[PDB]
């Protein structure tokens, strides 16, 4: 109840006997981590405006209590939107190109129509030359 799905399965990947300061994790109340916490929420507030982080994400940042989860949410929400803007640029590029394709397909259809329109005048001129000659 106090841990997540992924947090409870850590007990299986081995060595949890060994202290956390052997695996690179220390308990730190010092001016480094309050400066990193005050930076990481100011950065999120500057990312809330300019429509870079959703209102779903920032409330997860306020209820995280760990500087690495709230770091990964800034990273995750930037990659999602920058993927969405890059495909929105792509779909708007091909849409004007298929518009450029459908206008091109009809004007050569106009172009092929006037050449088949002309020859049937020309061959029927051969017919009206042919009938009275008998």
């Amino acid at each position: 109840y106090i841990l997540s799905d992924t947090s409870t399965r850590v007990m299986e990947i081995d060595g949890d006997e060994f202290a956390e300061a052997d695996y690179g994790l220390v308990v730190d109340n010092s001016n480094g981590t309050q400066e990193l916490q005050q930076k990481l929420d100011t950065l999120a507030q500057a990312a809330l405006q300019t429509q870079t982080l959703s209102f779903s994400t920032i409330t997860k940042l306020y209820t995280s209590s760990s500087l690495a989860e709230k770091q990964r949410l800034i990273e995750k929400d930037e990659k999602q939107i920058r993927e969405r803007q890059a495909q929105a640029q792509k779909e708007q590029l091909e849409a004007q190109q298929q518009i450029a394709a459908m206008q091109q397909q009809q004007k050569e259809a106009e172009l092929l129509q006037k050449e088949e329109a002309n020859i049937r005048d020309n061959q029927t001129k051969i017919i009206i030359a042919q009938i009275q000659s008998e």
Partner: protein
């Protein structure tokens, strides 16, 4: 979303979810506050974690 996470990150979330809960449950900042009064009176400040 746990593909962008790291192994040192999942170990760090589990460590904080243990520590953020039990600090708020037992009210640990008061246990450390009685321990300061023995620090100024004995010169000793001892705790057992069991």
């Amino acid at each position: 979303d746990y593909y962008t996470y790291e192994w040192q990150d999942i170990r760090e979330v589990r460590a904080n979810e243990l520590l953020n809960h039990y600090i708020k449950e037992y009210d640990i900042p008061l246990i450390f506050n009685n321990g300061f009064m023995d620090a100024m009176t004995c010169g000793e400040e001892i705790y057992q974690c069991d």
